[PDB]
Design an enzyme around this catalytic site. Structure first.
Site, PDB file in Angstrom:
ATOM      1  N   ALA B 163       2.404   6.351 -20.409  1.00 28.17           N
ATOM      2  CA  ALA B 163       1.071   6.950 -20.308  1.00 28.17           C
ATOM      3  C   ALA B 163       0.748   7.159 -18.823  1.00 28.17           C
ATOM      4  O   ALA B 163       1.332   6.480 -17.951  1.00 28.17           O
ATOM      5  CB  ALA B 163       0.009   6.026 -20.921  1.00 28.17           C
ATOM      6  N   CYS B 164      -0.184   8.045 -18.523  1.00 26.74           N
ATOM      7  CA  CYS B 164      -0.604   8.282 -17.143  1.00 26.74           C
ATOM      8  C   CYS B 164      -1.253   7.086 -16.532  1.00 26.74           C
ATOM      9  O   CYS B 164      -2.019   6.403 -17.199  1.00 26.74           O
ATOM     10  CB  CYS B 164      -1.530   9.482 -17.091  1.00 26.74           C
ATOM     11  SG  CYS B 164      -0.741  11.010 -17.639  1.00 26.74           S
ATOM     12  N   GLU B 165      -0.923   6.790 -15.252  1.00 27.33           N
ATOM     13  CA  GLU B 165      -1.505   5.669 -14.507  1.00 27.33           C
ATOM     14  C   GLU B 165      -1.294   4.356 -15.241  1.00 27.33           C
ATOM     15  O   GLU B 165      -2.059   3.404 -15.041  1.00 27.33           O
ATOM     16  CB  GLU B 165      -3.003   5.924 -14.212  1.00 27.33           C
ATOM     17  CG  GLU B 165      -3.204   7.145 -13.334  1.00 27.33           C
ATOM     18  CD  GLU B 165      -3.671   8.383 -14.059  1.00 27.33           C
ATOM     19  OE1 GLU B 165      -4.289   8.250 -15.136  1.00 27.33           O
ATOM     20  OE2 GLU B 165      -3.403   9.496 -13.554  1.00 27.33           O
ATOM     21  N   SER B 166      -0.206   4.264 -16.051  1.00 30.27           N
ATOM     22  CA  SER B 166       0.007   3.094 -16.875  1.00 30.27           C
ATOM     23  C   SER B 166       0.165   1.771 -16.128  1.00 30.27           C
ATOM     24  O   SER B 166      -0.174   0.721 -16.696  1.00 30.27           O
ATOM     25  CB  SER B 166       1.173   3.301 -17.840  1.00 30.27           C
ATOM     26  OG  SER B 166       2.297   3.913 -17.209  1.00 30.27           O
ATOM     27  N   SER B 192       2.084  10.563 -15.782  1.00 32.37           N
ATOM     28  CA  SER B 192       3.348  10.472 -16.478  1.00 32.37           C
ATOM     29  C   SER B 192       3.793  11.905 -16.889  1.00 32.37           C
ATOM     30  O   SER B 192       3.054  12.866 -16.670  1.00 32.37           O
ATOM     31  CB  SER B 192       3.281   9.526 -17.668  1.00 32.37           C
ATOM     32  OG  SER B 192       2.380  10.064 -18.614  1.00 32.37           O
TER      33      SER B 192
END
Lengths: 415, 415
Positions: B163-166, B192
Site C-alpha cells: 500500500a502507499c506510504e505503508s 506504492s
C-alpha cells in the site's frame, strides 16, 4: 543631442498589488530627479492605491522602509479604465490618434531620442498583465517595437520588465537589430518576487499589510539613485540588479535576471536613458514573497489584524476561501484539460514542459490567444493568477492539438 | 510442530483495482501449493473481478503475463459487504463470536502455530483501505496484534503489506516484542506501484485494460514460487523483494521496502510461514504505474479502445472528468484547510511535513479519526484516493490545532 523619454507601466490594481504602483511612482520620481521632463514621461497606473480606504498614509505611496512619499507629483496620464494594452501600444508608437482617453501624452519621439520603458506587475509565460481584464501578449509587444523602429522614431531604447516568467516575453522572439536592450526580473521558467513585505525582513513600517516593492524593481531603482549615472553603465546596473535579484544565488528565494536584444547598448552610460541627479557623487539577503502569493499574504495580514472583531475576521476568512477556491478552479481545470487531451501521466509532462532557452514559447501566437479564448468561454476568466497557465496553452498549440479538440476538452472540463 | 495459518486481504474493489484481488488470489494458490490447508487460510476479497462485465476472461483472474488462472478454488470467506475492518480484526483474533457474516473461518490458532498475513491495495500515511467505505487505522491494527500476542495464540507471525506510504503503518508504533516481523512495499513517504500494466513493459495480454499486479506483491510471490522455501530464509526474501521493488535503485519508478518488528524472525526458513512446494528444487526493469493513478490509466485505456463509438467515447471522457474533479475537490479542500488554519505559505509546510524515521505519524490516533470525521462531515467522503491526505490530518493533530478550529476551517472550506 536628443531627448530622453520614458513609459512607466503598472499592470495591476488592488491594494494587494500596492507594490507595482509604488515601483512605478518611485521610477517616475527618480527620472524627474535625473532631468527627464514630465512631458516626456508617460505614466500608466490604475491610481487606486494612494487614496485606498486601506492605505494607512492617505495620499502617500512609499516603495521602501525609509518611507519617502513617491506619489506626489506623478502625472495622471493613463489611469483607471485607460490602463489598456491598446493605449500602451499607441503611446509607444507616438500616435495620439490611436489613444482612447487619458491625457493624450504619447512618445512622439525623434530619431536622436532615447526611450526607457519600465513595467511592473503580474505575468506568465509569454504574457503580461494589464488591469482592466486584459492580457498583453509578448509578440504584440515585440511587433510594437518593430513598428516603432521601422518609423525611425528613436536612437536606442532600454526596457526593464518585472513580472513572473518575464524572460519568456523575449526568448526566441526579440530581435537584436532594433536598437533595443531588455532586461527581465526572471528567466522563462521562474516566478518574480515581492519584497519589503509585512512579517519579513527588511520590514516595512508596521501599519503596512501589503509589500512595498518588487525585488528586481527596487534593485534597479535603489542602484540608480545611489550612483552617478554619468559614470555607471547599463551593463553595471544589469550586473548589480542580477546579483541582488539572485539573493546570494539562493534561487529558492531569488531569480535569474536575463538580458535580450542589442547588448551593444550595455556599454552606454545610464544617464543617456535615466538622466543624472546633479547632487549624486557615487548588501544583505532580502526576505521575499512569490508574486502570485502576495495577495493571500495581505489577506492573512488583514485577518490577523482583525482577530478582536469576530464578524470582520469571519468575513476575511471567507474571502481567503473564495480566492483559494478560484485558484483551485483554474489550476484543476487546466490539469483536467491536459488529461482529456493527452491522457493521464502524459497531460502534465506535455502542459508543463519547458522549451530550451532561446526558443519561442509558442510557434503560433494567434493560436495561443485562441486557446485562452476557448478556455475562458467555458471555464471563466483567466484572471492575473491564471496567466501562470499560459505555458500549458502554448504547449497545447505546439503539440498540434486542434482548436476543435480544445473546445471539446474545455466543454467536458468546465460545463 | 504446529500449524501454518494465513490471512490474505485485498482492501479495494472495482475493475480498476483488479491487481489487488489478483495478488491475493495468487498468494492463496502459492500457499496451497506449499501445503497450507484451506481451513487455515482466510481470504478477504470483494469478489467483483472474476465475473466483472469488463473481464475479457470471464471467471478467470491472472497475476502476471504468463496468464495462469489464480481464481479457481479460492474460498469465499469474507467477500462483498463482509470485507470489513471489524471482520479482519475478529479473524486475526480467532473470535468467531465477533465475526459478522462471511464463512465464519477465523485464525483460532494455538501457541505453537505460525501466521502469515498479506494485504494488498490502497493506503495512505497511517492508514489502509477497506472496500466498504472504511479506513483501517494503523494503531488499531497494532492493537489487534498486541491482543493476539497477549492471548498466546501463536509462536511467530510474518506480515507483508502492499500500500502507499505503508512504512507509516509501523514506524514509531510497531513493538519488537510480539514475535511479529513485518515488511512494507514502501517507506512512510513514498507511494506504492502497480505493474504488468497495459501500454507498458512487461506487458499483460492485449485484452487487459487494467494492471495485473502490484510490484512488491508480485516480487515476493514470484520469488517464493521460484525457490525451495525449506532453504530460503525470510531475510533472503526481504532482500530480493527490496532489490526488485527498488527497480534498479530508480526511486522515481520504485520504492524502499522497509522492515519492522522482530528481526530475529528473518533468520527463519520461509517454509515455516509459507509452506514448501515439494516439486521445487530452487532480472530486468519493470514499467510501473503509481497506485493512485492506475484507475485513470484504466479509464484512458477504455476511452482509447472505444474511439470508434462516439457515444461510449464521450461517456468515458465525462467519467474521467468526474474522477479528476473529485480528486481536485479533495486536494484543494485539504490545501484550503491548511491555509485557513496556518496561513498561506505555512499551510503546505505544516500539512506536508514528514516526521523523522522512527517516529509515529500522529501522537493521538483518536484525534486523527476525529479530523477525518470533521473533514468528511463538511467536505464529503475521503475515498481511497483521499487517504493520501492522512499525513495532513495527522499534522493538524500534532500541531495543537483544536477540533473546534478544524470544524470552523472545514465549514469555511466546504459549506
Amino acid at each position: 543631442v536628443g531627448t530622453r523619454w520614458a513609459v512607466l507601466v503598472a499592470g495591476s490594481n488592488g491594494y494587494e498589488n500596492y507594490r507595482h504602483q509604488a515601483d512605478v511612482c518611485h521610477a517616475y520620481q527618480l527620472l524627474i530627479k535625473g532631468g527627464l521632463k514630465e512631458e516626456n514621461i508617460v505614466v500608466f497606473m490604475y491610481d487606486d492605491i494612494a487614496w485606498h480606504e486601506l492605505n494607512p498614509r492617505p495620499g502617500v505611496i512609499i516603495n521602501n522602509p525609509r518611507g519617502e512619499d513617491v506619489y506626489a507629483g506623478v502625472p495622471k496620464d493613463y489611469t483607471g479604465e485607460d490602463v489598456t494594452a491598446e493605449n500602451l501600444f499607441a503611446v509607444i508608437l507616438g500616435d495620439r490618434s490611436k489613444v482612447k482617453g487619458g491625457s493624450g501624452k504619447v512618445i512622439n519621439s525623434k530619431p536622436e531620442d532615447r526611450i526607457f520603458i519600465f513595467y511592473s506587475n503580474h505575468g506568465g509565460p509569454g504574457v503580461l498583465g494589464m488591469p482592466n481584464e486584459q492580457i498583453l501578449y509578448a509578440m504584440d509587444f515585440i511587433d510594437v517595437l518593430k513598428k516603432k523602429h521601422a518609423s525611425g522614431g528613436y536612437r536606442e531604447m532600454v526596457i526593464y520588465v518585472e513580472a513572473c516568467e518575464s524572460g519568456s516575453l523575449f526568448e526566441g522572439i526579440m530581435p537584436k537589430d532594433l536598437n533595443v536592450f531588455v532586461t527581465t526580473a526572471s528567466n522563462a521558467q521562474e516566478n518574480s518576487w515581492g519584497t519589503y513585505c509585512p512579517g519579513t525582513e527588511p520590514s516595512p513600517p508596521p501599519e503596512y499589510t501589503t509589500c512595498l516593492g518588487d525585488l528586481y524593481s527596487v534593485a534597479w531603482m535603489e542602484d540608480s539613485e545611489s550612483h552617478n549615472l554619468r559614470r555607471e553603465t547599463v551593463n553595471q546596473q544589469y550586473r548589480s540588479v542580477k546579483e541582488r535579484t539572485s539573493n546570494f544565488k539562493d534561487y529558492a528565494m531569488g531569480s535569474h535576471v536575463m538580458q535580450y536584444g542589442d547588448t551593444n547598448i550595455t556599454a552606454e552610460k545610464l544617464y543617456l536613458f535615466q538622466g543624472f541627479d546633479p547632487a549624486t557623487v557615487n548588501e544583505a539577503k532580502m526576505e521575499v514573497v512569490h508574486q502570485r502569493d502576495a495577495e493571500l499574504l495581505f489577506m492573512w495580514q488583514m485577518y490577523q489584524r482583525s482577530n478582536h472583531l469576530l464578524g470582520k475576521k469571519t468575513h476575511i476568512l471567507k474571502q481567503i476561501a473564495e480566492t483559494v477556491k478560484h485558484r483551485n478552479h483554474l489550476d484543476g481545470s487546466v490539469e483536467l484539460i491536459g488529461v482529456l487531451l493527452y491522457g493521464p501521466g502524459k497531460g502534465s509532462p506535455v502542459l508543463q514542459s519547458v522549451r530550451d532557452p532561446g526558443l519561442p514559447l509558442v510557434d503560433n501566437w494567434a493560436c495561443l490567444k485562441s486557446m485562452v479564448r476557448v478556455f475562458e468561454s467555458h471555464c471563466g476568466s483567466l484572471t492575473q493568477y491564471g496567466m501562470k497557465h499560459m505555458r500549458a496553452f502554448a504547449n497545447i498549440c505546439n503539440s498540434g492539438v486542434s482548436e476543435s479538440s480544445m473546445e471539446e476538452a474545455c466543454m467536458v472540463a468546465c460545463g
